[PDB]
Each structure stands twice: as C-alpha cells, then as structure tokens.
C-alpha cells in the first residue's frame, strides 16, 4: 500500500537516512499521482527535526505543492531555530502571507523577540507589515537596526 510504503519513507527521513526515504518517495511519485501523495510532505514537515527538514525539501520539495500545506509555520520554525533563512524559508512566509495567518506570522514574531540574525528578524518583519502588523513588524525591524542592518536602520528612519 502507498501509504505504508510512505510511513517508511517518513521514519527513515525523520531518523536521517535521508537517501534511504527519499528513494522510497521517489517510487512513489512515479507510480501515483501528485493529488494522491501531495499529503505526505504536510505530514513531515509537522515533525522532522530542523536538522534534516533543509534536506528532505532540497531534494523532494518540488514533488509536492507546500502551498496546500496548512503547517507551513514549521518551517519557518526550523529556519529560526536553524538561525538559517534560506529558499524554503521564504517561500512558506510567502505562502503563510497569501494564507492570511496573521496568527502563525505573529507567533513567529514574539518568538524571535532574541538570538535570531538580522535577516532572519527583517524577513518576519515585512511579511508582517503585509499582513497588517505594523506595530511588531517596526519592533523587529528596530531590532534589526539594533544588531547592525542597514537598510533597517534606514527603514525605521522614515517611520
């Protein structure tokens, strides 16, 4: 069954074996079609560790369509604990924005508010404005300015 043969593929990614669980995706992406498996990636990006999500996306992230995931929060989670911003980062804050999840964005903000590098807080910053935020969005961009950005410094300037 496709969706046993998908639990395998999950345990062996969420352990690491990332070679191992994505050739097993791989088959099934050959032998079903895309409004059948799309699921599965949702499903793991609930719960892989940070430390291999960056992974599994980089190899099979364009086998599924994310913007049909509701969870995307988690990897902009993993881009924060990863301290990391990368492609697959922006692109779930894209989505999370054309979502309308003010909520999940807004999370994300408290929780940087601190570690997180200056890109990181500019990212959130101005996906927040685009949802409404204005007032968390400037808080993290003053942070931003804080830390050394630039161009941050000069936004907080014209607010």
């Known amino acids: 069954e496709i969706i046993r043969k998908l639990m395998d593929a999950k345990k062996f990614l969420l352990d690491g074996y990332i070679d191992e669980g994505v050739k097993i995706v791989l088959e099934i992406t050959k032998s079903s079609t895309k409004s059948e498996?799309?699921?599965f990636i949702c499903n793991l990006l609930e719960s892989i560790d940070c430390r291999?999500?960056?992974q599994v996306l980089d190899k099979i992230g364009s086998y599924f369509d994310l913007d049909?995931?509701?969870n995307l929060k988690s990897v902009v989670e993993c881009?924060?604990?990863?301290?990391?911003?990368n492609e697959?980062?922006?692109?779930?804050l894209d989505i999370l924005v054309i979502q309308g999840k003010?909520?999940?964005?807004?999370?994300?903000?408290?929780?940087?508010?601190?570690e997180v590098s200056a890109s990181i807080l500019?990212?959130?910053?101005?996906a927040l404005r685009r949802v409404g935020d204005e007032r968390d969005a400037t808080t993290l961009l003053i942070e931003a300015c804080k830390k050394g950005e630039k161009e941050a410094c000069?936004?907080?300037?014209?607010?």
């Open 37 to 39: 498996y799309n699921w």
């Open 52 to 54: 291999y999500m960056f």
């Open 68 to 70: 049909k995931c509701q």
């Open 79 to 85: 881009g924060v604990i990863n301290n990391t911003l």
């Open 88 to 92: 697959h980062v922006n692109k779930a």
């Open 102 to 114: 003010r909520d999940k964005l807004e999370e994300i903000g408290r929780e940087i508010l601190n």
């Open 122 to 126: 500019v990212a959130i910053a101005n």
């Open 154 to 159: 000069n936004a907080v300037n014209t607010l």
